[PDB]
From a paper:
Human α-amino-β-carboxymuconate-ε-semialdehyde decarboxylase (ACMSD, EC 4.1.1.45) stands at a branch point of the de novo NAD+ synthesis pathway, starting from the essential amino acid tryptophan, and plays an important role in maintaining NAD+ homeostasis. In detail, ACMSD catalyzes the decarboxylation of 2-amino 3-carboxymuconate 6-semialdehyde (ACMS), an intermediate in the de novo NAD+ synthesis pathway, to 2-aminomuconate-6-semialdehyde (AMS), through a metal-mediated, O2-independent, non-oxidative decarboxylation reaction, which proceeds through a metal-bound hydroxide. ACMSD is catalytically inactive in the monomeric form and active in the homodimeric form since the neighboring subunit contributes with one of the two substrate-binding arginine residues. Similar to previously published X-ray structures, the active site of hACMSD is located at the C-terminal opening of the β-barrel and characterized by a Zn2+ metal ion coordinated with a distorted trigonal bipyramid geometry, by residues His6, His8, His174, His 224, the moiety of Asp291, and a conserved water molecule.
In this study, we report the crystal structure of the complex of human dimeric ACMSD with TES-1025 (4), the first potent and selective ACMSD inhibitor. The human ACMSD crystal structure in complex with TES-1025 at 2.5 Å resolution was refined to final Rwork and Rfree values of 0.210 and 0.252, respectively. The molecular replacement solution of the hACMSD structure in complex with TES-1025 comprised four monomers in the asymmetric unit to form two homodimers. In AB, two TES-1025 molecules were observed, while in CD no electron density was observed that could be attributed to a TES-1025 molecule. In homodimer AB, there are no disordered regions, while in homodimer CD there are disordered regions namely in chain C between residues 30–37, 178–185, and 242–253 and in chain D between residues 242–253. The carboxylic moiety of the ligand coordinates the Zn2+metal ion (Zn···O distance is 2.5 Å) and establishes an H-bond with the indole moiety of Trp191 residue (the H···O distance is 2.6 Å, and the N-H···O angle is 135.8°) while interacts with Asp291 through a water molecule. The pyrimidine ring interacts through the carbonyl group with Arg243 (the H···O distance is 2.5 Å, and the N-H···O angle is 143.6°), belonging to the neighboring subunit (chain B) of the functional dimer of ACMSD, while a second H-bond is established with the catalytic residue Trp188 (the H···O distance is 2.7 Å, and the N-H···O angle is 132.5°). The negatively charged nitrogen of the TES-1025 pyrimidine ring engages a charge–charge interaction with the positively charged nitrogen of the Arg47 (the N···N distance is 3.6 Å). The 2-thiophene ring fits into a hydrophobic cavity generated by Trp176, Phe46, Met180, and Trp191; this latter residue also makes Pi–Pi stacking with the phenyl ring of TES-1025.
Numbering used by the authors:
A (entry chain B), B (entry chain A): 2 to 335
The structure:
Amino acid sequence: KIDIHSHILPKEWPDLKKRFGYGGWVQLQHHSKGEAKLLKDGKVFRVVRENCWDPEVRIREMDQKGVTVQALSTVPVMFSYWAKPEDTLNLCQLLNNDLASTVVSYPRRFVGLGTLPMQAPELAVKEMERCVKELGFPGVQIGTHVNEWDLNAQELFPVYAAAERLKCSLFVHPWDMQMDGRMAKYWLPWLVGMPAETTIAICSMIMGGVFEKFPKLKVCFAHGGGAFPFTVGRISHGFSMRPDLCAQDNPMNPKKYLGSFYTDALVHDPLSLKLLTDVIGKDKVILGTDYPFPLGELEPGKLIESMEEFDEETKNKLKAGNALAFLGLERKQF
Amino acid sequence: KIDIHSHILPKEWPDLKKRFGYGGWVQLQHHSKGEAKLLKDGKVFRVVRENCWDPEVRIREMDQKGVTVQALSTVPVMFSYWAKPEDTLNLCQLLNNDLASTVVSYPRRFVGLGTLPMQAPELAVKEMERCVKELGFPGVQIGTHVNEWDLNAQELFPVYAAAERLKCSLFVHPWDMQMDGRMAKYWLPWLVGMPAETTIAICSMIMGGVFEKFPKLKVCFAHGGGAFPFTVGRISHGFSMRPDLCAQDNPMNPKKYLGSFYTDALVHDPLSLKLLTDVIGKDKVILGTDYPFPLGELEPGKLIESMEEFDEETKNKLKAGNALAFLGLERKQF
Ligand SMILES: N#Cc1c(-c2cccs2)nc(SCc2cccc(CC(=O)O)c2)[nH]c1=O
Ligand SMILES: N#Cc1c(-c2cccs2)nc(SCc2cccc(CC(=O)O)c2)[nH]c1=O
Ligand SMILES: [K+]
Ligand SMILES: [K+]
Ligand SMILES: [K+]
Ligand SMILES: [K+]
Ligand SMILES: [Zn+2]
Ligand SMILES: [Zn+2]
């Protein structure tokens, strides 16, 4: 029904080294029909298909797979938290506007998840205010960390305060793992580095008092919380054993916040999905696909259809019900 | 009945900075009765009790907790893979001999797992052969990586080949995670760094072809494999979707290796333990405690015994049966 985890790019965008005056950016080249390359200062790193930018193609594959709504967000490599703040804000506004146009073209099939200049919180609050009031976005997508800041950093608290005030949902996506060293092999940053990033982000928001200070803030973590649903016992036990190290910014045990945030259902395995629903809750698991990248779910929702343990009310919660709750929307997409 | 995961230190050892000519080593200083300080070049990093060195104290606690046998291994901070090879080997002789003398004093309560100078595979094979033949150890404890080498590195294959031949089991313990920067907070190196170090180690051994090339090698991973039982779906899926990044040293899928290695049961929560035996297998999960450190299990086997889902045959496999099969020992312990 609803896919909370899908990425989209504009059909094109200007040379960002020319626009801003320094390198490190991502561009897009239509080298042949139906395909395109993603470059970084000339060096290609991935090839994408038409479904990465063309909404016409996405709607076709959405009807084919049974998907009703896609929550569109940018590709996390575009976060650009490393750049100068004024330049990231410029890029965020470019990416957010293209999202708004794609959503208003098919308001029954798309919702928008914006991008924020997280390195400059005063600018990110303003761009969030524009994303909610003007662009009508139900939420934004942010990384699991912002340069040397984990999501516990006090500098980020005005952004959380604004998001809780604006009723702006947060989708926390892992990015900027170590790409070299020992991690330059076996696709380790994707297979292991990204789940570790999400686990760090969950712990950092819990022990940083984020969920405590902003109880109404609605957060969702990608890839089923990473390793958190399995390692929560170790984390919870460690908090109890060393409160001098873990209980200084927030005194509550991390298990208290089970049921205070969401994760997506992208775990590929039924055993992993059952533990996910068992630990996080049947009301806090949302169907996500990572469309259109191949590391995601090929048949959206097939893993939830196959679970004989879930009743039909629970399947419909993971397929679409929990997405509506996290986004703060109603059933207006028949 | 059997605890495969417990650490012990010698009561004393000389000034290592003077023994080897450089700093960075660990010293044990007794400041009070029943307590001692661990120093890294004068700076304390934890206070330990007498049960970390005194075997008499361990015996009393083992009787009171119901533990028949402890597998004694050194504390991973003593791995010393960063130092000169001939100096780390010097330390391995000191640690393994002291480990050996504690086993001969109570030979039905202890078996030894020696330490090796893994940064010099040729010396490691020598000292390991000495451990098995001259000292009688059924295995050794090694880290999840040796400097820039992961456990897939072909430089370490002489260690694996000697292990299959000598019938020497490998207990792989996470160590040398990032300790500073973003990880310097909330005990993250132990709560998140250690499980991730172990997940990387399982992936490197699988995708490096270690289990295929040494099918009789007996390997056990610590802390329930870290994140592997929960994220094996994503790891297996990422292997099939990108054979050009993962399948260049071993074409077999990671799922085919569920059942080719052991993990301990140190996962603290019932749902984590049930998933652990669902993925790794009821015959490949071993009771481990991390004695005497507080992050471990205070009452060994209490979690296993409380599992209503398990039959008595399964509980005995986790309590002692799987440890004996992994260590390759018979019931010489009454
Ligand atoms: N290596 C490598 C490599 C790279 C990069 C190298 C350096 C910077 S990005 N990008 C891609 S495209 C899909 C994508 C790109 C960026 C973030 C995400 C988050 C997710 O959906 O999982 C997915 N595919 C690759 O294999
Ligand atoms: N931070 C910090 C910190 C440190 C260190 C800092 C730098 C080097 S060690 N050591 C201890 S003592 C038990 C122990 C020490 C070393 C490895 C293991 C593996 C296991 O869990 O069994 C346990 N406790 C701490 O909290
Ligand atoms: K919202
Ligand atoms: K920053
Ligand atoms: K053995
Ligand atoms: K137990
Ligand atoms: Zn994604
Ligand atoms: Zn340990």
